[PDB]
Amino acid sequence: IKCMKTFFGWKEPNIIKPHEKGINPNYLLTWKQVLAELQDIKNEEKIPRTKNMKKTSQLKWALGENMAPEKVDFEDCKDVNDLKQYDSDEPEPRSLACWIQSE
Amino acid sequence: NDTDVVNFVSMEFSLTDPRLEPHKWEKYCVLEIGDMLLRTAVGQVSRPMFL
Amino acid sequence: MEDFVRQCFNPMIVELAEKAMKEYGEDPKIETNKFASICTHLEVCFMYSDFHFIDERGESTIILKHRFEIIEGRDRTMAWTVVNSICNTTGVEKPKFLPDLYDYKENRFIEIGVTRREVHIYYLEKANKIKSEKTHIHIFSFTGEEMATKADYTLDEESRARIKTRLFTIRQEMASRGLWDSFRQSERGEETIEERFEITGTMRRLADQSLPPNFSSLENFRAYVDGFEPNGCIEGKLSQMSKEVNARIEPFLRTTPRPLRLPDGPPCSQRSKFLLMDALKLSIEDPSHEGEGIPLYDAIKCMKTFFGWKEPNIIKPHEKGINPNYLLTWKQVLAELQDIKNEEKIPRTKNMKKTSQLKWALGENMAPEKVDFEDCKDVNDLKQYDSDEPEPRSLACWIQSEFNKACELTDSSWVELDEIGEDVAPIEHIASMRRNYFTAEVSHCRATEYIMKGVYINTALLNASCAAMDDFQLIPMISKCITKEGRRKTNLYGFIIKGRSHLRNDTDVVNFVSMEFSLTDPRLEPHKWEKYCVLEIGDMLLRTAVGQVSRPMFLYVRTNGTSKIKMKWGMEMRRCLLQSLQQIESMIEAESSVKEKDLTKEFFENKSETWPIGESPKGVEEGSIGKVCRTLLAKSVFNSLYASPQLEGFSAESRKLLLIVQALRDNLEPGTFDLEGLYEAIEECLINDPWVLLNASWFNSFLTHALR
Amino acid sequence: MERIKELRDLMSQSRTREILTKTTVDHMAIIKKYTSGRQEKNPALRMKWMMAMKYPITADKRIMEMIPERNEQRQTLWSKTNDAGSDRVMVSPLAVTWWNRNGPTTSTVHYPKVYKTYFEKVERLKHGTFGPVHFRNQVKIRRRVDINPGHADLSAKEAQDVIMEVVFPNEVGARILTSESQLTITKEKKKELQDCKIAPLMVAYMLERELVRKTRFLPVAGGTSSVYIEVLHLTQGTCWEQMYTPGGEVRNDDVDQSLIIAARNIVRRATVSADPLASLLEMCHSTQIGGVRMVDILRQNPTEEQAVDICKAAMGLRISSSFSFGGFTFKRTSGSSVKREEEVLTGNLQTLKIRVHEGYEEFTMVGRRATAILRKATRRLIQLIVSGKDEQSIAEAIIVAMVFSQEDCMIKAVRGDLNFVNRANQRLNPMHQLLRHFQKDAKVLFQNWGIEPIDNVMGMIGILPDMTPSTEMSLRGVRVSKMGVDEYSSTERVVVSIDRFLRVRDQRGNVLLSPEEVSETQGTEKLTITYSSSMMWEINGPESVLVNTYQWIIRNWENVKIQWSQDPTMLYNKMEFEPFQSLVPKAARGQYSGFVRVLFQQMRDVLGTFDTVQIIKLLPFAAAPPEQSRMQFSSLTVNVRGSGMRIVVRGNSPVFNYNKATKRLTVLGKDAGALMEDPDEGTAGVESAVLRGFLILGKENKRYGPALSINELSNLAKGEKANVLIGQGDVVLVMKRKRDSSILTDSQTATKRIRMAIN
Amino acid sequence: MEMGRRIHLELRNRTPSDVKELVLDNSRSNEGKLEGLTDEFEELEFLSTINVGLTSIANLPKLNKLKKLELSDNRVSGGLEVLAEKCPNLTHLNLSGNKIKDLSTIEPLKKLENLKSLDLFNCEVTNLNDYRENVFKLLPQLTYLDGYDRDDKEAPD
């Protein structure tokens, strides 16, 4: 909290480079939730050791709870058109990039 | 189980423009959540603060 | 209007207007034209005296002391005191009436007024009213006009423009809000009057004659109502009226209900537009011939695939028509077919030459001429149109057999539903699974054959009717199908000939004659086909365990009529499909709710769970999901084919009895007051329809089962 | 030409001339509803019939020059015929398809721009994410929800004005030509749609669809955001559900929270004031919320809260005849009650003056996490029903309901003193204190409230005092429904009375709203809030005080600059600068004032080096006794809630950030405003030809010359007056402005004068 | 806008000899070469060219009073001897965001002995290991690199 209070250049968050294969808006929503929760903590008096974020749609979506496949026996899902073994396929080749050298 | 996977979401501050080498950034979502004043030979210049 | 005044002006000015009116004992909520007038008055007053000041040297200036002093916004005593003080200090003369503003630079009282009408008229009225030359006058108009004495307008062009423009914008907003007319109207000379709507003349007498017995004038009735207070009038009336006016609950317990009595008479006769279970189709498995697609070409090719054209002869006579004319119609159809076959230049459509048999068959010119009643009023035979009771009939077993044959499967697929977008969402995939399962369940059922056949029939009929206005067009009854081998098969049920199609309304009828092939013998059940004419047109070889047996191939000719609305309702029969699904899916979903999991597979592939879906001598019969699917589809399709007012009447008046008995089953202790009335209302709906009589028998059976 | 010749033909006949000259343009749309045709019943059947014809599609005369009579197969595309009522030639669908396959081609560059809403739907779908379906009982609570995301939430009138300026440039009403706020969106759209051949009516309708808000009453069971409503078919079912997320952009605003905070501050600071009504009115009239006056937002936004409701009652408007008690919106439904004052002794030997309702009343309460109903007799709780997602929601709702009942049974069940006092140290009314006390702990009351058995039936279950489900026994008149209860369907807005104490009293003499019922929680202003009122910066704090001071300075920039150039001293002694110097330490304010004053002396001595940003930055520091000093300051301290914040005289600083590229000024991150300039030669004449700031001068005048079209007014010289056609054909004489004022400040001086006179 | 019009606007109907600071922001140059600036400018002391679309500083005049030169957010690449000789009195320099390959091209800046601060950002040279110390070695006169000195301390004005 003290480290955060040292900055005053906060703007309205907006996405410059979005997650192509993912959920872009919910990242923004959860960041806003983080900031609001920190302000709410600031408004408190007897702050406990740690504070647990309340369950929210954007929080679950960013975490992946709502994107997690459920559990069911193979008997009840055998007749699925696109039911395949886990994608144990060799990842595609990637060319050498200069950024690791700089790293 | 020791191999049980816990999922987390990580937000990290930064000051590098991700439009310079976007290919390096494929698993990340970039927001612009503020501006920072940095001292240089021509005074305090404002630059974006990425997340 | 009042809301507009509150929102558009400064609230403080609204408060001043409210106080000024309340001084007179008025409520703005009852009168708003005066409220708006006063608000405009105060606004223009304060605009006039704004941004004006007196400099050090006494010259006027725009931004010390206010050059203009307001008098109109104050009370009577305050305004009079300030005007007297001005008169004494500056030695001004007392105006005969209270002004609005006082200009200090010129030291004069100026009255200001905003007029909805022309400026000049208001100026003249004000001048006549005041009758003094010591008070200046400034009149503004919402339209952008103003006037003053000698045109000596005190303000500069800027402030005059500001006031003009404020009033102009107010006028535009009032007009766009639909209140400008009333506002301009309420102004009468120099005062604003409340809206008046008084009953005088004719309505006064009408109201005097439209009151309870013990009153004579509308004003007396209004006075009585205003002074009325509730003193046990209802209690006294209840204590007076006889006990015989009461709603008595009659117990309903397992013994009261009885079956619905069907009407007695002869067995009911078929009335469908087309043959349903007795049709025969001439088939070509693969139409790969030249000029394919045209109905005439396919019909001719199907015709050429059959031999056995023997001399036709009346088998079941049209008891009312002229059978030889029907025979001649069929002979002409055949002869034209041979002629066009030998032409070798088959066009898209075939027009039949008008003939005596054709004109009579399609009811051409067989209609009484219209005459004036007075001219033929002496005719003894003249009598009101016959609209007596329709003949009661008896439920005949043919309807049950037709329905049973409707709810069963066929050899080929009678539906080719179009494509949709690719499934992506998981629910899209579940929906595709359910849809494909249902389609496979009823993609070949007989009811689907009925749907496709009727759709094609009515489509061709309407298209020819619009394209061929004043010609007799020969319309083959064709259908397409997909055999077990997956071959595009074409089937010819029969032919249709349409009469004059000069149709203008959606209820006027076009008369046609339909000739459908068949293999049944009408003589077995004559009362079924008492509207048909049957010609034994050939012999067909049917294969059986004993080889090829020759049977007589008949051709049912009948004369019918169709209206544009009826043709549209025929082309809408495909919607029947949806109805069936909408009754099963819910059930599926229901169980899913009680199981918290999908149940499409455990229903469409288990084939173990069943529902009671019929009756048999052993008892009640249980059926699988497919049985119910096709049963509901057949019921919907037949309801479409056998639609009649009595059907809906019986359904509506029977739902109540169904709900009563079910409530009894749930142990809810139901009761009724005039159950016999409900029974009579239900029974009134059973006269002649085969479908309704069948449904009544079904309800009797269900009541018999449920009561036990 | 064709138009004028047709008008002459119309004028030739007597009746057409009479209707032309009689009817005023105001009633034009009234004579547009007098159609002598006949509406086609069952248009589906009609279309089916029509399609069979040869030429069922109507085209225009010009088609004769582009589409040939026959195609390669000699089919007839268009026929030499005319429609019934016009000269629309007759053509077949063949003509449409031929045009599509062989017609002239252009660029649809503006189609995405005009149709941004539909393409936005496309993008939101194209980037969505799905999840596993779940099958279970579904509860779809019914409520109002948005429809079209991407809207500016403008009022219909404002959308109409924007459309009229954008696509109808030289036909705009008088309100626009007598208007000052040229919305940024209007100029944006005008730039976007420069060369657009699309039919202007289509453009107008699409802009209306894009910029307007819409709300519908639907049953939802999950997310309620606008982007979560457009896919409600795909997301919620009767027995199933679908995990989905739009992948576009959300535009969740925050002005509602700012309005909540503003109203709360106004009521909190006016309740103690001498004349809360006039004071609050003056504040609301002179306050700005993110660049817009608060009056517009109050009239526009459909907010429901005690502070805003009391503000409306004072200003005079309609509000719901209900109160949001304990975080739950209440609503009376049946019965009647009479309010009686009484004194009640609690279980802690505490005497409280209360007002209780006697009667057989019934209420429905809708909270953030529950829905409940309560039938109450005269000081007797009769029936209570609640339904909620979690047990804690159930408990808080039941506690709120029981404290509302105000029965005598709980009075003896009070344990501990009830001396709760809000953050303002103002005594809280007894019912709120009891509510907080029972929130803290209610086990003792539960044990001694009441216990009785209940018959078991489907759809409803009991509750034991430890807040656990039960079927065989529950509390007196307390029950919970296993299925969600639909919220109230409608609300009644009635005329109400407001007293100087900001208490809203119904027409029957009862009280409806009170400031004491207003929550005292403090939030943060996402958007800057500006006030021009009295010394009301009590809860503002230094953070917002700095922004308010800079805003006040920049609003009066012209007067401030003139005073600085001519009379620096009086400007320095301005009262409004008092709070800024409060933040600056009292041991150094003199040095800062002297340094800035000598800097201004040097500034005025030199010429050609004018710098507005420096003057704006350093003006507030020159309002203290300027003790002489020689050290050349470089960072003037600025106390901000016990945190020394410095200001660099040269260059930007965190406490004062001005971006030259965008010419925008912000203080401590919060928005402050912008400067009025563009070229580096002290002028503001370089604009996009803003066609605003004109004043009419009555009807048309012939001397000034032939009437001009609005689009060509820009050539007018400063103060020149001409004749222009405004509205739908109304010629008026207009002029350019000479005095830099507006219509807003009119009547204010006379307003205050007459207000003093009346009181 | 274009170069010459921007320079004329900045001049403010004054001779090109009484300007102590010139701001050329978001301007444009033809063929990526400096245009407009001439020898007449002799009082300029704080120049700034941002997003100007210059390929290289090859037409810079002899602004002997040029002290705070800024070439930021541009694509300048090539020899820097022109800057070394034309303006030998540079004190503060900014090349943030420029296109520079390695130190072999930044060597000529060592000629200016008054360069108290050199700023580089988002460049290719900064990728090299020990870029800060190597540049400091190459430019001993430098005292504040990227707004920081040899000991990582912010540089107050």
mmCIF file with all atom_site columns, N, CA and C in Angstrom, chain B residues 19-50:
data_model
loop_
_atom_site.group_PDB
_atom_site.id
_atom_site.type_symbol
_atom_site.label_atom_id
_atom_site.label_alt_id
_atom_site.label_comp_id
_atom_site.label_asym_id
_atom_site.label_entity_id
_atom_site.label_seq_id
_atom_site.pdbx_PDB_ins_code
_atom_site.Cartn_x
_atom_site.Cartn_y
_atom_site.Cartn_z
_atom_site.occupancy
_atom_site.B_iso_or_equiv
_atom_site.pdbx_formal_charge
_atom_site.auth_seq_id
_atom_site.auth_comp_id
_atom_site.auth_asym_id
_atom_site.auth_atom_id
_atom_site.pdbx_PDB_model_num
ATOM 1  N N  . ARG B 1 19 ? 4.967  -2.417  -28.595 1.00 0.00 ? 19 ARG B N  1
ATOM 2  C CA . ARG B 1 19 ? 4.829  -2.334  -30.040 1.00 0.00 ? 19 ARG B CA 1
ATOM 3  C C  . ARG B 1 19 ? 6.179  -2.273  -30.744 1.00 0.00 ? 19 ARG B C  1
ATOM 4  N N  . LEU B 1 20 ? 7.278  -2.393  -30.001 1.00 0.00 ? 20 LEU B N  1
ATOM 5  C CA . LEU B 1 20 ? 8.608  -2.455  -30.595 1.00 0.00 ? 20 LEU B CA 1
ATOM 6  C C  . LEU B 1 20 ? 8.937  -3.868  -31.063 1.00 0.00 ? 20 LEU B C  1
ATOM 7  N N  . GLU B 1 21 ? 8.752  -4.854  -30.187 1.00 0.00 ? 21 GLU B N  1
ATOM 8  C CA . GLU B 1 21 ? 8.937  -6.267  -30.510 1.00 0.00 ? 21 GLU B CA 1
ATOM 9  C C  . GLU B 1 21 ? 7.718  -7.017  -29.995 1.00 0.00 ? 21 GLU B C  1
ATOM 10 N N  . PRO B 1 22 ? 6.565  -6.860  -30.653 1.00 0.00 ? 22 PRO B N  1
ATOM 11 C CA . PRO B 1 22 ? 5.350  -7.515  -30.148 1.00 0.00 ? 22 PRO B CA 1
ATOM 12 C C  . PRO B 1 22 ? 5.458  -9.027  -30.094 1.00 0.00 ? 22 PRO B C  1
ATOM 13 N N  . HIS B 1 23 ? 6.212  -9.643  -31.009 1.00 0.00 ? 23 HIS B N  1
ATOM 14 C CA . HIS B 1 23 ? 6.323  -11.097 -31.008 1.00 0.00 ? 23 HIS B CA 1
ATOM 15 C C  . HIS B 1 23 ? 6.862  -11.615 -29.682 1.00 0.00 ? 23 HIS B C  1
ATOM 16 N N  . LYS B 1 24 ? 7.731  -10.846 -29.022 1.00 0.00 ? 24 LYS B N  1
ATOM 17 C CA . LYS B 1 24 ? 8.203  -11.245 -27.702 1.00 0.00 ? 24 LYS B CA 1
ATOM 18 C C  . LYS B 1 24 ? 7.055  -11.339 -26.708 1.00 0.00 ? 24 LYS B C  1
ATOM 19 N N  . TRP B 1 25 ? 5.988  -10.580 -26.929 1.00 0.00 ? 25 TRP B N  1
ATOM 20 C CA . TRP B 1 25 ? 4.832  -10.547 -26.037 1.00 0.00 ? 25 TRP B CA 1
ATOM 21 C C  . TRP B 1 25 ? 3.660  -11.197 -26.763 1.00 0.00 ? 25 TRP B C  1
ATOM 22 N N  . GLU B 1 26 ? 3.389  -12.455 -26.430 1.00 0.00 ? 26 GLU B N  1
ATOM 23 C CA . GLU B 1 26 ? 2.264  -13.189 -26.989 1.00 0.00 ? 26 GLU B CA 1
ATOM 24 C C  . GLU B 1 26 ? 1.314  -13.731 -25.938 1.00 0.00 ? 26 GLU B C  1
ATOM 25 N N  . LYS B 1 27 ? 1.803  -14.052 -24.743 1.00 0.00 ? 27 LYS B N  1
ATOM 26 C CA . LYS B 1 27 ? 0.966  -14.553 -23.664 1.00 0.00 ? 27 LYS B CA 1
ATOM 27 C C  . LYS B 1 27 ? 0.475  -13.453 -22.736 1.00 0.00 ? 27 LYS B C  1
ATOM 28 N N  . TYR B 1 28 ? 0.850  -12.203 -22.988 1.00 0.00 ? 28 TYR B N  1
ATOM 29 C CA . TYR B 1 28 ? 0.562  -11.095 -22.092 1.00 0.00 ? 28 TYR B CA 1
ATOM 30 C C  . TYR B 1 28 ? -0.496 -10.177 -22.686 1.00 0.00 ? 28 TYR B C  1
ATOM 31 N N  . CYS B 1 29 ? -1.258 -9.539  -21.803 1.00 0.00 ? 29 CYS B N  1
ATOM 32 C CA . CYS B 1 29 ? -2.161 -8.455  -22.161 1.00 0.00 ? 29 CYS B CA 1
ATOM 33 C C  . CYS B 1 29 ? -1.594 -7.157  -21.608 1.00 0.00 ? 29 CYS B C  1
ATOM 34 N N  . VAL B 1 30 ? -1.418 -6.166  -22.475 1.00 0.00 ? 30 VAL B N  1
ATOM 35 C CA . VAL B 1 30 ? -0.769 -4.912  -22.111 1.00 0.00 ? 30 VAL B CA 1
ATOM 36 C C  . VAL B 1 30 ? -1.837 -3.843  -21.942 1.00 0.00 ? 30 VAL B C  1
ATOM 37 N N  . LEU B 1 31 ? -1.877 -3.241  -20.758 1.00 0.00 ? 31 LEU B N  1
ATOM 38 C CA . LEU B 1 31 ? -2.674 -2.057  -20.486 1.00 0.00 ? 31 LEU B CA 1
ATOM 39 C C  . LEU B 1 31 ? -1.746 -0.865  -20.296 1.00 0.00 ? 31 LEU B C  1
ATOM 40 N N  . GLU B 1 32 ? -2.305 0.334   -20.434 1.00 0.00 ? 32 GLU B N  1
ATOM 41 C CA . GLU B 1 32 ? -1.586 1.583   -20.189 1.00 0.00 ? 32 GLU B CA 1
ATOM 42 C C  . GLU B 1 32 ? -2.295 2.270   -19.026 1.00 0.00 ? 32 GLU B C  1
ATOM 43 N N  . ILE B 1 33 ? -1.792 2.050   -17.815 1.00 0.00 ? 33 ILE B N  1
ATOM 44 C CA . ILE B 1 33 ? -2.515 2.399   -16.600 1.00 0.00 ? 33 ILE B CA 1
ATOM 45 C C  . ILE B 1 33 ? -1.942 3.652   -15.938 1.00 0.00 ? 33 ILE B C  1
ATOM 46 N N  . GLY B 1 34 ? -1.149 4.434   -16.654 1.00 0.00 ? 34 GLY B N  1
ATOM 47 C CA . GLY B 1 34 ? -0.624 5.657   -16.086 1.00 0.00 ? 34 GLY B CA 1
ATOM 48 C C  . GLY B 1 34 ? 0.521  6.209   -16.906 1.00 0.00 ? 34 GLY B C  1
ATOM 49 N N  . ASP B 1 35 ? 1.021  7.352   -16.442 1.00 0.00 ? 35 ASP B N  1
ATOM 50 C CA . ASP B 1 35 ? 2.143  8.044   -17.058 1.00 0.00 ? 35 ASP B CA 1
ATOM 51 C C  . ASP B 1 35 ? 3.149  8.417   -15.979 1.00 0.00 ? 35 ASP B C  1
ATOM 52 N N  . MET B 1 36 ? 4.431  8.312   -16.313 1.00 0.00 ? 36 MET B N  1
ATOM 53 C CA . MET B 1 36 ? 5.519  8.567   -15.383 1.00 0.00 ? 36 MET B CA 1
ATOM 54 C C  . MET B 1 36 ? 6.386  9.702   -15.907 1.00 0.00 ? 36 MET B C  1
ATOM 55 N N  . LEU B 1 37 ? 6.804  10.579  -14.998 1.00 0.00 ? 37 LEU B N  1
ATOM 56 C CA . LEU B 1 37 ? 7.685  11.692  -15.323 1.00 0.00 ? 37 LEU B CA 1
ATOM 57 C C  . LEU B 1 37 ? 9.123  11.280  -15.028 1.00 0.00 ? 37 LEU B C  1
ATOM 58 N N  . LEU B 1 38 ? 9.952  11.247  -16.067 1.00 0.00 ? 38 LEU B N  1
ATOM 59 C CA . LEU B 1 38 ? 11.338 10.817  -15.967 1.00 0.00 ? 38 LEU B CA 1
ATOM 60 C C  . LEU B 1 38 ? 12.258 11.973  -16.333 1.00 0.00 ? 38 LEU B C  1
ATOM 61 N N  . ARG B 1 39 ? 13.324 12.137  -15.554 1.00 0.00 ? 39 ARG B N  1
ATOM 62 C CA . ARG B 1 39 ? 14.277 13.210  -15.788 1.00 0.00 ? 39 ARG B CA 1
ATOM 63 C C  . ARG B 1 39 ? 15.239 12.833  -16.905 1.00 0.00 ? 39 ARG B C  1
ATOM 64 N N  . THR B 1 40 ? 15.424 13.756  -17.846 1.00 0.00 ? 40 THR B N  1
ATOM 65 C CA . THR B 1 40 ? 16.369 13.591  -18.938 1.00 0.00 ? 40 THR B CA 1
ATOM 66 C C  . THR B 1 40 ? 17.020 14.942  -19.207 1.00 0.00 ? 40 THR B C  1
ATOM 67 N N  . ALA B 1 41 ? 17.926 14.964  -20.186 1.00 0.00 ? 41 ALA B N  1
ATOM 68 C CA . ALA B 1 41 ? 18.688 16.171  -20.481 1.00 0.00 ? 41 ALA B CA 1
ATOM 69 C C  . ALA B 1 41 ? 17.812 17.349  -20.891 1.00 0.00 ? 41 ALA B C  1
ATOM 70 N N  . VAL B 1 42 ? 16.513 17.138  -21.105 1.00 0.00 ? 42 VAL B N  1
ATOM 71 C CA . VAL B 1 42 ? 15.616 18.209  -21.523 1.00 0.00 ? 42 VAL B CA 1
ATOM 72 C C  . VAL B 1 42 ? 14.456 18.317  -20.539 1.00 0.00 ? 42 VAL B C  1
ATOM 73 N N  . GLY B 1 43 ? 14.695 17.952  -19.286 1.00 0.00 ? 43 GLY B N  1
ATOM 74 C CA . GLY B 1 43 ? 13.706 18.128  -18.241 1.00 0.00 ? 43 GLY B CA 1
ATOM 75 C C  . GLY B 1 43 ? 12.951 16.857  -17.913 1.00 0.00 ? 43 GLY B C  1
ATOM 76 N N  . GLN B 1 44 ? 11.796 17.043  -17.279 1.00 0.00 ? 44 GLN B N  1
ATOM 77 C CA . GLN B 1 44 ? 10.955 15.927  -16.849 1.00 0.00 ? 44 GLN B CA 1
ATOM 78 C C  . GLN B 1 44 ? 9.978  15.605  -17.974 1.00 0.00 ? 44 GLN B C  1
ATOM 79 N N  . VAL B 1 45 ? 10.264 14.535  -18.714 1.00 0.00 ? 45 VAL B N  1
ATOM 80 C CA . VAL B 1 45 ? 9.452  14.109  -19.850 1.00 0.00 ? 45 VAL B CA 1
ATOM 81 C C  . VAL B 1 45 ? 8.478  13.038  -19.384 1.00 0.00 ? 45 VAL B C  1
ATOM 82 N N  . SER B 1 46 ? 7.274  13.048  -19.949 1.00 0.00 ? 46 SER B N  1
ATOM 83 C CA . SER B 1 46 ? 6.239  12.091  -19.583 1.00 0.00 ? 46 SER B CA 1
ATOM 84 C C  . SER B 1 46 ? 6.256  10.913  -20.546 1.00 0.00 ? 46 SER B C  1
ATOM 85 N N  . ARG B 1 47 ? 6.256  9.701   -19.995 1.00 0.00 ? 47 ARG B N  1
ATOM 86 C CA . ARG B 1 47 ? 6.225  8.486   -20.791 1.00 0.00 ? 47 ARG B CA 1
ATOM 87 C C  . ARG B 1 47 ? 5.181  7.528   -20.237 1.00 0.00 ? 47 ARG B C  1
ATOM 88 N N  . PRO B 1 48 ? 4.564  6.717   -21.092 1.00 0.00 ? 48 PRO B N  1
ATOM 89 C CA . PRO B 1 48 ? 3.505  5.822   -20.614 1.00 0.00 ? 48 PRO B CA 1
ATOM 90 C C  . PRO B 1 48 ? 4.040  4.770   -19.656 1.00 0.00 ? 48 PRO B C  1
ATOM 91 N N  . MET B 1 49 ? 3.172  4.340   -18.744 1.00 0.00 ? 49 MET B N  1
ATOM 92 C CA . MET B 1 49 ? 3.482  3.296   -17.772 1.00 0.00 ? 49 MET B CA 1
ATOM 93 C C  . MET B 1 49 ? 2.592  2.097   -18.076 1.00 0.00 ? 49 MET B C  1
ATOM 94 N N  . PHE B 1 50 ? 3.197  1.023   -18.571 1.00 0.00 ? 50 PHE B N  1
ATOM 95 C CA . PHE B 1 50 ? 2.455  -0.140  -19.026 1.00 0.00 ? 50 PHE B CA 1
ATOM 96 C C  . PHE B 1 50 ? 2.314  -1.176  -17.916 1.00 0.00 ? 50 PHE B C  1
#
